[PDB]
Design an enzyme around this catalytic site. Structure first.
Site, PDB file in Angstrom:
ATOM      1  N   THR A   1      -3.641  -9.837   2.743  1.00 26.04           N
ATOM      2  CA  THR A   1      -3.276 -10.186   4.110  1.00 26.04           C
ATOM      3  C   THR A   1      -4.500 -10.328   5.007  1.00 26.04           C
ATOM      4  OG1 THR A   1      -2.986  -7.865   4.719  1.00 26.04           O
ATOM      5  CG2 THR A   1      -1.085  -9.030   3.827  1.00 26.04           C
ATOM      6  N   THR A   2      -5.580  -9.608   4.700  1.00 30.17           N
ATOM      7  CA  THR A   2      -6.786  -9.696   5.517  1.00 30.17           C
ATOM      8  C   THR A   2      -7.502 -11.022   5.290  1.00 30.17           C
ATOM      9  OG1 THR A   2      -6.969  -7.291   5.321  1.00 30.17           O
ATOM     10  CG2 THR A   2      -8.881  -8.460   6.178  1.00 30.17           C
TER      11      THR A   2
ATOM     12  N   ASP B   1      -7.310  -0.427   7.810  1.00 31.59           N
ATOM     13  CA  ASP B   1      -6.350  -1.355   7.231  1.00 31.59           C
ATOM     14  C   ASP B   1      -6.029  -2.428   8.264  1.00 31.59           C
ATOM     15  OD1 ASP B   1      -4.454  -1.947   4.920  1.00 31.59           O
ATOM     16  OD2 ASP B   1      -3.024  -1.791   6.579  1.00 31.59           O
TER      17      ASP B   1
ATOM     18  N   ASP C   1       2.027  -0.567  -3.129  1.00 30.15           N
ATOM     19  CA  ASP C   1       0.915  -1.509  -3.115  1.00 30.15           C
ATOM     20  C   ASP C   1       0.515  -1.898  -4.532  1.00 30.15           C
ATOM     21  OD1 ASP C   1      -2.199  -2.211  -2.882  1.00 30.15           O
ATOM     22  OD2 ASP C   1      -1.299  -2.479  -0.897  1.00 30.15           O
TER      23      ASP C   1
HETATM   24  N1  LIG Z   1     -17.652  -4.149  -5.524  1.00 32.08           N
HETATM   25  C1  LIG Z   1     -17.195  -5.305  -4.976  1.00 32.08           C
HETATM   26  N2  LIG Z   1     -18.040  -6.260  -4.512  1.00 32.08           N
HETATM   27  C2  LIG Z   1     -17.559  -7.402  -3.974  1.00 32.08           C
HETATM   28  N3  LIG Z   1     -16.256  -7.696  -3.850  1.00 32.08           N
HETATM   29  C3  LIG Z   1     -15.310  -6.830  -4.273  1.00 32.08           C
HETATM   30  C4  LIG Z   1     -15.738  -5.557  -4.871  1.00 32.08           C
HETATM   31  N4  LIG Z   1     -14.614  -4.892  -5.198  1.00 32.08           N
HETATM   32  C5  LIG Z   1     -13.562  -5.669  -4.836  1.00 32.08           C
HETATM   33  N5  LIG Z   1     -13.977  -6.820  -4.279  1.00 32.08           N
HETATM   34  C6  LIG Z   1     -13.101  -7.912  -3.782  1.00 32.08           C
HETATM   35  O1  LIG Z   1     -12.727  -7.723  -2.416  1.00 32.08           O
HETATM   36  C7  LIG Z   1     -11.380  -8.167  -2.240  1.00 32.08           C
HETATM   37  C8  LIG Z   1     -10.692  -7.396  -1.122  1.00 32.08           C
HETATM   38  O2  LIG Z   1     -11.043  -7.999   0.120  1.00 32.08           O
HETATM   39  P1  LIG Z   1     -10.268  -7.627   1.481  1.00 32.08           P
HETATM   40  O3  LIG Z   1     -10.440  -6.154   1.756  1.00 32.08           O
HETATM   41  O4  LIG Z   1     -10.660  -8.633   2.535  1.00 32.08           O
HETATM   42  O5  LIG Z   1      -8.728  -7.933   1.135  1.00 32.08           O
HETATM   43  P2  LIG Z   1      -7.620  -6.775   1.036  1.00 32.08           P
HETATM   44  O6  LIG Z   1      -7.609  -5.992   2.327  1.00 32.08           O
HETATM   45  O7  LIG Z   1      -7.767  -6.060  -0.286  1.00 32.08           O
HETATM   46  O8  LIG Z   1      -6.284  -7.666   0.976  1.00 32.08           O
HETATM   47  P3  LIG Z   1      -4.836  -7.032   1.262  1.00 32.08           P
HETATM   48  O9  LIG Z   1      -4.820  -6.757   2.747  1.00 32.08           O
HETATM   49  O10 LIG Z   1      -3.899  -8.133   0.823  1.00 32.08           O
HETATM   50  O11 LIG Z   1      -4.809  -5.792   0.402  1.00 32.08           O
HETATM   51  C9  LIG Z   1     -10.697  -7.970  -3.581  1.00 32.08           C
HETATM   52  O12 LIG Z   1      -9.804  -9.053  -3.843  1.00 32.08           O
HETATM   53  C10 LIG Z   1     -11.818  -7.949  -4.599  1.00 32.08           C
HETATM   54  O13 LIG Z   1     -11.774  -9.133  -5.396  1.00 32.08           O
END
Ligand SMILES: Nc1ncnc2c1ncn2[C@@H]1O[C@H](COP(=O)(O)OP(=O)(O)OP(=O)(O)O)[C@@H](O)[C@H]1O
Ligand SMILES: Nc1ncnc2c1ncn2[C@@H]1O[C@H](COP(=O)(O)OP(=O)(O)OP(=O)(O)O)[C@@H](O)[C@H]1O
Ligand SMILES: Nc1ncnc2c1ncn2[C@@H]1O[C@H](COP(=O)(O)OP(=O)(O)OP(=O)(O)O)[C@@H](O)[C@H]1O
Ligand SMILES: Nc1ncnc2c1ncn2[C@@H]1O[C@H](COP(=O)(O)OP(=O)(O)OP(=O)(O)O)[C@@H](O)[C@H]1O
Lengths: 523, 512, 244, 519, 100
Positions: free
Chosen positions: B81-82, B48, B379
């Site tokens: 946030t990431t 995370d 969340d």
């Molecule tokens: N199978 C998949 N293939 C590609 N992208 C995906 C898949 N499943 C989810 N995602 C995308 O990846 C994104 C998550 O990216 P990331 O982990 O950088 O952010 P996050 O950590 O979820 O954000 P936060 O910290 O706010 O929760 C989601 O918004 C989603 O749209």
């Protein structure tokens, strides 16, 4: 010892690994070579403080003089220098165009390799964009020459070659070369650069120069013969003095009575050597060394025109003009090593006696541009401007096509290539897009040397080319960052000079990017 | 000591690029884990991004500003946030236009703030309305966070917890549709039971236990009373202390302590109440006169929790215990209950309506399971809040990034001036979100990203996204990878608001 | 010599005093003007405050040097005199020291520099006062409407500049009152700017009076009254208490 | 292991220009204090150990020989200054480095050097037209003869000197020496000789060629000095009995040839003396010393002989007599012989001196100095050489300007006023070009020991009121009108010094990278 | 005291010099365009000379302050030149350093 040298296994040569980026060291090798000539491009470019290997000082801004004196040792940077000598062949312009555009090609190629693109795929996109650059270049031809063989057509088109070689002589050097090439222009297909020989006399300045026909030497006639139409020319590099045999020849002097006998015998042998030229019918003798005072008396006795040429470079010019071979012996009476000229006579230009070698029964293609100057350093810079001025019009004996210059053919070529690179699918659109951005560094090098911010000029050039206003180039002004029309100002370069320049600079990006390891080998 | 010039403009770039390079590979469902080394030898393998930068100390002033701007962004919305710190590090990473071109940052800020207006205008063109009345469409939004969790066995019941909580807090009468989960939806944890036992009640729960059986067990008409003053010994206007060491002082203090409390307790039992709620603490002798009337003692409640009790029953907040009246009644409440749940006592003032407040009751087999649901539901509550704030979704998974970066290229052909060169750099900096998704999947990044841009040019820009499971390109209308609009609106807004703050800094000086 | 410290004199204390004073000018060099750049104020605790106003920069700037401590007190003489101007004094005086430091190397004593600066300052006020403009042109002649239009260009209000500049020109001339012997100044209190949803930004109206954002409640009481008496009171007509 | 330089000395950019600007100032510092007539001299010693004492800027730079590249660019400008006008090497060397000093902070702030090139070509072209407007032609102004005006400028140049009391006598001799020459004036034609002893009133002016005559051999009481038309012979042959070069050594063992051996050695001397008698040379001048036996030969043959003549005085005698210098004696004929009208052996200063008067090519003169020391006459020779130079330039060029920094402070005022009306990058550069031209009245106050700031602040205040010909004074410690005090300089040398200092400053600025070949 | 007042005029030029570098313009052109217009007001009193020329930092072109309405009070301009010269006098009077 452990651990061993990674990938360096051939004669201890420094083989950089994949993390050490062995292909990136060749990019930094051609970056340093391009940076020495990036600020030297254009009429606002800086001079270079040249210290020759014979401890002679020079101040010049020619692109060929920088590469000859700065001895490069990196062989990855030697591929552009060997391409710059290929740029010297078949055209006399674009030596800075090879060093800047291929240097901007590899500098933009390093940004593509940082993403993770293979070197075999980027090099295939450059050869694709090179063939696309050869199609728009006939379409960018605005006007052409008139082909009337007059002074006004030659002097109006020669203003591009005089620009950035010798600034300030734009009105003087455009008319001096124009009076020389029009004597060879009726001879179609026979215009050659070695027919126009340059001579230099120490004088007042540029405005005292003049143009003469035939071969003109600055040395005056040592004899009293003014004009003779003799065809036999016997060139002798030996000095006119007493005879020294190739045998032993021990001359013994003990008392003063033997001093007067052998000194008179040397004068009699000097009379016999001039008589050895008089019987074969040669009244034209060129002396390579010094001439004695008694040898001047034998010149007017047999009415033989004697001239003295001390310099070896002007003596070699007569060997490839009339066919006369310089003999090292004391005047050998042979006929096969002689020359052929219709008339040789002595005349004055600017209160300076010069000898003219012209032909009346032959058509004649030899011309000599008598240059005058106070300093020998600046006079040599005008001498190289003649060679880069005649070779500018040596290519115009071919198909006369003219393109506009000053970034007019550079931004318009970068606009149509990006349109071909945007519609092209596949991964090869990245190499074509960087081939167009390498064309923007040459107006960036022209604007940065003029004291103007380069991004303001590029956005001004892309605004007028988006509306279709073609032939718009850089206005040469440090205070005014605007632009001006190139057809109204009179800057038109050569289409064939721009054809080989993009071809050789792209192949320089082909040859360097194929090399990714340097190994020393012993024979 | 001090530093000024162009070095701090490059020094703040490498300070933000170092933070962005740490959590760059933690994007998507294939997020790589990160190992943290403690001085005591402990190791946490959490992936995370909020947990990584919290346990890492920074010393740069620009790198310290990078963490706090995402920490405040985590308090606003619970997702995205990431992607903020990745986009804030990529916009500053192209330093060729910042240093080599000798450009002032004012040209860049005028190009960055002009590109900010094209962020909101493009996302409203690729948007899609949401049928929020159908519960099947709400299940396809929250399911992206319930996967690979222990709550995923009860996804049909856990989705009913978060959906019923956000609708009670949201007030349609006010127009602006405010949702605040921290106050009106205070979540409490109760040990014992199972995951199926956890439900949502319409009231406020008090975690104070029952210490005496002389209390109200089941009251149908609860008469509630609220008070702010304390129930203890009378203190003066000075700052004197109370110390009982002598037997003569023990009698005089306790006689004044009994006479004042009996005078205070006579005013509250004359109205015949059922439960007393005081703001301050209740002493041991104050419960002795209170147990004779069989009143439930509730003490140590904050002022913020006090107004939720007043809006639940309709009572009056009375400042002093001598000034009670007959209007302080709780008529209309459902039932008062002190029934034990898993050997813990809880007071219930719940009703059969929506009195502008609620609570969440969690149950589970062990206390580790209680901490697992509350971090998954909170969340999930902030994601479903953004859907009910504005019923609009965007094609996620890198599809919205390539749709935005395609609109900036055609807009840059008509944008004349010097500022068009940093304007095109934002379009290539927004491609880092589908770039790391292919790199985390393991496929060839440039081979897939080039065909990704070819699909966004000729075909529709609302489709042809990236699936972060198989490693190829799929259509976003076929799979439920839809992101909320208000999350993606504040993501590009904060990434510009970070880049406008770090690039404007031109001097770092000290001084207390 | 045995003293209670270190002693240093000559021109080397002149060059060290101007290098410590001009370094403070570089702290307030880029922050000058309305487009001035922000600068980080690192505290001893660890937090940082992002300020671009030059008056708050010199208040938090702590340089333990007596040459830099001279420029700290002129910020207190600037706000107490007029209230504005602060960092324009710093860049002028530090460039005054840097040009005078070149005069010390050019064999000029500073006594001619001090007496020459006071005559250059008094002649600067003479050339300024001979080229002034009296406070007039309030109505009929614009250098105003266009004066406030430049300040309004940075926001989204600048699309219709002529519509909103008329609302601030007539509001400035309305709050004019002399109140002491023909002073006229303008108070720190100004017009109350309320907002509503009038379906576009073009429905703004210049109301010549104060507007209260309150609702009267009942409707049976008439909303249009003619009498002049206005009652104001702070005590509650609700059920009163002794103390909270 | 693969290098591009491998010993190649090369660098470019901004600090290559700053390294070339500061290297230009070390050459200006070598000739900074030598400016002015009261300047300090420099002491230069060669490899042999001989110390040279001179304050001339042309002699300092010829013996410096700095191996720096930018220092070699100031050498050929001083060489071209001798061909263009004749002198002014210390003026264009100081002026070239001060152009680069004022623009040295402007290069470091990011300004391109090519814009400073465009400003130096502009302000110098305005300085050419500004000089010719203020330059007045003084030929027959106020109906005064030019001989009286030429004694007035030499009086100020010889003021505050050793002969400042008797400057009325020395001013009349320097005018008549140039008046004795033809229209082709030359400083090499008028020679200066020194005679030790006597007061300053005994200085004489020889209309012809006179030399030192260090011949201290025998030959008294004969060889009469007065000759009507003598034949001047210029020889380089030794006429001694036992000479170091002319001898005869034959080793025989017969007593009969021993008389002939000494007679053959005498016949080397006798036949070399008999050829002068056949040619008719009445006076015998030789570089090598002449023995006592050859002086007895010309005593009976009614001729004169004088050896130990320097070759510099022999070449001045060749230009006066119109003959030729012959080394041998068999080629001595009338083609190389000279002629004069008056020749006599004078006794001025106690020593014997020979001088010819009345030559057909009498284009050379000789100045005789008298004094109690040779170093008194050494500084008098250089001061009288300076007095001839001001007189000579007044005859050639009539359009003159006021010297003493008056034309430099007037050019600093006009170029400052032109810069205020020009927007763009030409304001701060041409305005720095006007302040860089103030180093000529500033170094004139430094070398004279005056207060450099008290005069220059009053000099610019005089130019602000309307003074166009006010400059510094070398005698008085105040400003004075140099046009009224006859401190003049021609307009052509002031123009050619400005176009040479601007060209030397442009060649340094246009150089940005140094190329060195490893050899 | 000529060099004291002449360097006082060049020291006042840092106010348009820092304003030109903050407006992303060429500081050698924008400051010199201010002095090219203000010099003509002193040479001849003709109305073709541009008078009261301000500095518009937005477009990078000098304009008239009477048309643009850019005005400043006199007491902020008088007391700035009064306080800056008295502060430069006090630091210039320091010729010795004593520490304890
Ligand atoms: N199978 C998949 N293939 C590609 N992208 C995906 C898949 N499943 C989810 N995602 C995308 O990846 C994104 C998550 O990216 P990331 O982990 O950088 O952010 P996050 O950590 O979820 O954000 P936060 O910290 O706010 O929760 C989601 O918004 C989603 O749209
Ligand atoms: N005054 C000018 N106006 C417009 N364009 C110019 C000018 N001077 C140079 N150029 C541009 O510079 C390029 C050629 O310049 P340049 O004269 O420096 O090359 P070159 O010196 O002739 O090459 P070489 O070193 O082989 O002689 C052309 O593209 C031309 O358009
Ligand atoms: N409307 C305007 N147009 C152009 N320039 C302006 C305008 N208003 C102010 N300026 C310039 O901005 C500068 C003011 O800078 P800033 O407000 O950042 O600090 P300051 O007010 O000088 O500091 P302090 O409060 O001590 O005086 C002034 O020098 C002025 O020249
Ligand atoms: N008698 C004089 N009184 C006042 N100033 C003089 C006098 N003679 C010369 N100067 C000034 O001195 C300057 C030159 O000084 P100096 O004679 O040392 O150099 P120079 O030999 O003239 O240089 P160059 O040989 O290059 O001409 C000139 O600018 C001139 O104005």
């Amino acid at each position: 010892k452990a651990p061993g040298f990674a990938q360096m296994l051939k004669e201890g040569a420094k083989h950089f690994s994949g993390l050490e980026e062995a292909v990136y060291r060749n990019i930094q090798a051609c970056k340093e070579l391009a940076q020495t000539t990036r600020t030297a491009y254009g009429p606002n470019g800086m001079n270079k403080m040249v210290i020759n290997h014979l401890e002679k000082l020079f101040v010049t801004n020619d692109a060929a003089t920088i590469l000859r004196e700065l001895e490069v040792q990196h062989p990855a940077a030697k591929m552009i220098v060997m391409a710059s000598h290929m740029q010297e062949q078949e055209v006399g312009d674009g030596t800075n165009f090879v060093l800047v555009f291929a240097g901007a090609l590899l500098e933009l190629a390093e940004e593509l390799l940082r993403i993770g693109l293979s070197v075999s795929e980027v090099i295939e996109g450059y050869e694709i964009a090179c063939r696309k650059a050869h199609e728009i270049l006939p379409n960018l031809v605005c006007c052409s020459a008139k082909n009337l063989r007059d002074i006004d057509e030659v002097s109006s088109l020669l203003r591009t070659s005089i620009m950035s070689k010798q600034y300030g002589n734009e009105v003087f050097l455009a008319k001096l070369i124009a009076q020389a090439c029009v004597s060879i222009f009726p001879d179609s297909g026979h215009f050659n650069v070695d027919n126009i020989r340059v001579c230099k006399i120490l004088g007042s300045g540029i405005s005292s120069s003049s143009v003469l026909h035939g071969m003109v030497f600055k040395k005056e006639t040592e004899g009293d013969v003014t004009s003779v139409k003799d065809a036999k020319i016997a060139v002798y590099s030996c000095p006119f003095d007493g005879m020294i045999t190739e045998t032993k020849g021990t001359v013994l002097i003990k008392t003063a009575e033997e001093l007067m006998n052998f000194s008179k015998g040397e004068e009699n042998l000097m009379d016999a050597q001039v008589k050895a030229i008089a019987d074969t019918g040669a009244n034209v003798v060129v002396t390579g060394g010094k001439v004695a005072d008694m040898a001047l008396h034998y010149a007017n006795k047999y009415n033989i025109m004697l001239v003295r040429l001390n310099s070896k470079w002007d003596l070699r010019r007569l060997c490839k003009t009339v066919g006369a071979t310089a003999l090292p012996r004391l005047t050998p009476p042979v006929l096969e090593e002689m020359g052929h000229c219709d008339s040789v006579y002595l005349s004055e230009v600017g209160d300076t006696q010069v000898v003219v070698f012209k032909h009346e029964k032959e058509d004649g293609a030899i011309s000599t541009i008598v240059l005058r100057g106070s300093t020998d350093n600046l006079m040599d810079d005008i001498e190289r401007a003649v060679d880069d001025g005649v070779n500018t019009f040596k290519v115009l004996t071919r198909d006369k096509r003219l393109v506009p210059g000053g970034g007019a053919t550079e931004i318009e070529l970068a606009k149509q290539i990006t349109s071909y690179g945007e519609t092209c699918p596949g991964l090869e659109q990245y190499a074509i897009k960087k081939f167009a951005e390498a064309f923007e560094a040459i107006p960036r090098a022209l604007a940065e040397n003029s004291g103007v911010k380069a991004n303001e000029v590029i956005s001004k050039l892309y605004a007028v080319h988006q509306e279709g206003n073609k032939n718009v180039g850089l206005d040469i002004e440090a205070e005014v960052p605007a632009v001006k029309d190139m057809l109204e100002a009179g800057i038109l370069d050569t289409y064939l000079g721009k054809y080989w320049a993009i071809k050789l600079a792209t192949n320089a990006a082909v040859t360097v990017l194929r090399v990714d390891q340097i190994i020393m080998a012993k024979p | 000591k001090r530093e000024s010039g162009r070095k701090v403009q490059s020094g703040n770039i490498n300070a933000a690029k170092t933070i962005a390079d740490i959590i760059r590979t933690c994007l998507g469902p294939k997020s790589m884990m990160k190992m943290l080394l403690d001085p005591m030898g402990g190791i946490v393998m959490t992936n995370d991004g909020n947990a990584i930068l919290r346990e890492i100390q920074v010393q740069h002033p620009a790198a310290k500003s990078m963490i706090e701007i995402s920490r405040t962004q985590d308090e606003e919305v619970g997702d995205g946030t990431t992607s903020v710190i990745i986009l804030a590090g990529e916009m500053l990473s192209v330093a060729e236009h910042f240093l080599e071109q000798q450009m002032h940052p004012t040209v860049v800020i005028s190009a960055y703030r002009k590109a900010l207006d094209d962020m909101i205008s493009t996302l409203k063109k690729i948007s899609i309305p949401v049928d929020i009345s159908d519960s099947d469409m709400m299940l396809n939004i929250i399911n992206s966070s319930i996967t690979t969790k222990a709550i995923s066995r009860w996804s049909s019941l856990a989705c009913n917890i978060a959906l019923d909580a956000v609708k009670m807090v949201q007030f349609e009468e006010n127009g602006r549709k405010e949702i605040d989960i921290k106050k009106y939806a205070r979540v409490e944890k109760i040990p014992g039971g199972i995951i199926e036992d956890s439900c949502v009640l319409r009231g406020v729960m008090i975690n104070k236990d029952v210490t005496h059986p002389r209390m109200r067990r089941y009251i149908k008409n609860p008469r509630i009373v609220l008070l702010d003053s304390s129930l203890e010994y009378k203190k003066g206007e000075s700052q004197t202390d109370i110390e009982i060491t002598r037997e003569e002082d023990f009698t005089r203090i306790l006689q004044m302590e009994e006479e004042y409390i009996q005078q205070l307790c006579e005013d509250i039992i004359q109205l015949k109440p059922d439960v007393v709620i005081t703001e301050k603490g209740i002493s041991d002798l104050a419960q002795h006169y209170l147990m004779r009337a069989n009143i439930t003692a509730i003490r140590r409640v904050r002022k913020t929790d006090n107004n939720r009790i007043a809006r639940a029953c309709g009572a009056r907040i009375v400042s002093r215990p001598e000034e009670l009246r007959e209007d302080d009644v709780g008529t209309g409440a459902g039932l008062l209950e002190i029934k034990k749940i898993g050997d813990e006592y809880f007071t219930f003032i719940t009703d059969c309506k929506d009195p502008k407040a609620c609570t969440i009751l969690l149950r589970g087999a062990s206390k580790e399971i209680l901490s697992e649901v509350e971090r998954n539901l909170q969340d999930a509550m902030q994601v479903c809040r953004n859907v009910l704030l504005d019923p609009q979704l965007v094609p996620g998974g890198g599809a919205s990034e390539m749709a935005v970066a395609h609109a900036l290229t055609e807009k840059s052909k008509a944008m004349t001036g010097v500022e068009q060169w940093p304007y095109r750099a934002v379009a290539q900096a927004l491609e880092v979100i589908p770039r790391t998704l292919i790199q985390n999947c393991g496929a060839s990044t440039i081979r897939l990203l080039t065909s990704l841009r070819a699909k966004h040019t000729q075909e529709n820009c609302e489709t042809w996204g990236v699936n972060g499971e198989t490693g190829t390109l799929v259509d976003m209308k076929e799979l439920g990878i839809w992101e909320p609009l208000a999350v993606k609106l504040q993501t590009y807004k904060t990434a510009v608001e970070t880049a406008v703050l770090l690039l404007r800094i031109d001097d770092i000086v000290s001084g207390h | 010599l045995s003293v209670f410290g270190d002693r240093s004199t000559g021109e080397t204390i002149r060059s060290q005093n101007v290098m410590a004073a001009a370094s403070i000018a570089n702290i307030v060099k880029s922050s000058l003007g309305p487009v001035g750049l922000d600068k980080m104020l690192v505290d001893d605790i660890g937090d940082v405050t992002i300020t671009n106003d030059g008056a708050t920069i010199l208040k938090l700037l702590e340089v333990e040097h007596p040459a830099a401590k001279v420029l700290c007190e002129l910020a207190d003489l600037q706000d107490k005199e007029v209230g504005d101007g602060t960092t324009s004094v710093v860049i002028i005086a530090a460039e005054l020291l840097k040009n005078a430091d070149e005069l010390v190397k050019q064999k000029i004593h500073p006594t001619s520099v001090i007496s020459g600066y006071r005559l250059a300052c008094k002649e600067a006020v003479r050339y300024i006062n001979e080229n002034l403009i009296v406070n007039t042109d309030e109505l009929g002649r614009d250098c105003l409407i266009n004066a406030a239009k430049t300040s309004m260009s940075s926001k989204i209000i600048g699309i219709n500049g002529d519509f909103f500049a008329n609302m601030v020109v007539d509001a400035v001339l309305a709050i004019k009152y002399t109140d002491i012997r023909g002073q006229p100044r303008y108070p720190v209190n100004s017009v109350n700017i309320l907002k509503a949803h009038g379906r576009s930004q073009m429905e703004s109206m210049l109301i010549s009076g104060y507007a209260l954002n309150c609702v009267v409640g009942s409707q049976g009481m008439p909303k249009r009254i003619v009498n002049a008496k206005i009652a104001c009171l702070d005590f509650s007509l609700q059920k009163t208490k002794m103390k909270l | 292991v693969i290098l591009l330089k491998e010993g190649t000395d090369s660098s470019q950019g901004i600090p290559q220009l700053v390294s070339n600007i500061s290297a230009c100032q070390v050459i200006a510092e070598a000739v900074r204090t030598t400016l002015g007539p009261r300047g300090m001299d420099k002491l230069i010693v060669d490899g042999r150990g001989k110390a040279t004492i001179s304050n001339d800027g042309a002699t300092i730079l010829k013996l410096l020989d700095v191996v720096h590249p930018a220092a070699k660019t100031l050498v050929d400008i001083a060489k071209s200054q001798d061909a263009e006008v004749g002198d002014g090497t210390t003026s264009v060397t100081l002026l070239a480095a001060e152009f680069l000093k004022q623009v040295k902070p402007y290069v470091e702030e990011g300004l391109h050097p090519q814009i400073i090139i465009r400003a130096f070509r502009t302000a110098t072209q305005l300085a050419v037209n500004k000089i010719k407007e203020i330059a007045v032609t003084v030929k027959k102004a106020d109906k005064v003869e030019q001989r009286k005006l030429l004694e007035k400028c030499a009086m100020t140049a010889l003021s505050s000197k050793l002969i400042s009391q008797q400057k009325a006598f020395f001013a009349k001799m320097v005018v008549d020496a140039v008046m004795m020459l033809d229209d082709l004036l030359q400083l090499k034609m008028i020679g200066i000789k020194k005679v030790q002893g006597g007061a300053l009133e005994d200085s004489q002016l020889v209309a012809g060629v006179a030399f030192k005559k260090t011949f201290s051999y025998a030959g008294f009481e004969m060889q009469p000095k007065k000759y009507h038309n003598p034949k001047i012979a210029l020889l380089n042959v030794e006429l001694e009995l036992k000479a170091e070069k002319d001898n005869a050594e034959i080793r025989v063992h017969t007593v009969e040839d021993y008389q002939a051996i000494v007679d053959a050695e005498w016949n080397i001397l006798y036949d070399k003396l008999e050829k002068i008698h056949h040619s008719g040379a009445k006076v015998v001048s030789s570089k090598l010393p002449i023995g006592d036996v050859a002086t007895q030969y010309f005593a009976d043959r009614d001729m004169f002989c004088a050896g130990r003549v320097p070759e510099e005085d022999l070449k001045r005698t060749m230009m006066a007599c119109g003959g030729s210098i012959q080394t041998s004696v068999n080629a001595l004929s009338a083609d190389v012989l000279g002629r004069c009208q008056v020749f006599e052996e004078t006794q001025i200063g106690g020593e014997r001196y020979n001088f010819f008067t009345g030559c057909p090519k009498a284009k050379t003169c000789t100045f005789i100095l008298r004094g109690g020391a040779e170093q008194f006459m050494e500084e008098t020779e250089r001061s009288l050489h300076d007095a001839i130079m001001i007189v000579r330039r007044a005859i050639k060029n009539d359009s003159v300007v006021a010297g003493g920094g008056a034309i430099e402070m007037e050019l600093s005022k006009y170029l400052r006023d032109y810069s205020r009306t020009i927007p763009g990058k030409q304001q701060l550069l041409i305005g720095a070009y006007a302040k860089a031209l103030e180093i000529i009245p500033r170094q004139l106050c430094d070398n004279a020991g005056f207060d450099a700031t008290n005069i220059l602040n009053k000099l610019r205040a005089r130019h602000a009121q309307g003074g166009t010909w006010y400059g510094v004074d070398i005698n008085n410690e105040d400003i004075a009108d140099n046009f009224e005090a006859f401190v003049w300089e021609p307009a052509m040398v002031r123009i050619n010094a400005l176009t040479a200092a601007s060209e030397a400053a442009c060649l340094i600025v246009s150089v940005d990278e140094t190329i060195k070949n490893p050899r | 005291e000529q060099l004291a007042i002449a360097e006082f005029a060049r020291s006042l030029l840092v106010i348009p010099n820092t304003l030109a570098v903050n407006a992303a313009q060429d500081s050698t052109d924008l400051v010199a365009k201010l002095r090219a217009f203000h010099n003509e007001a002193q040479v001849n009193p003709e109305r073709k000379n541009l008078k009261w020329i301000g500095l518009d930092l937005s477009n990078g072109k000098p304009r008239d302050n009477k048309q643009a309405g850019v005005f400043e009070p006199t007491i902020v301009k008088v007391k700035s030149l009064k306080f800056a010269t008295e502060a430069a006098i006090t630091i210039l009077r320091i010729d010795d350093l004593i520490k304890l």
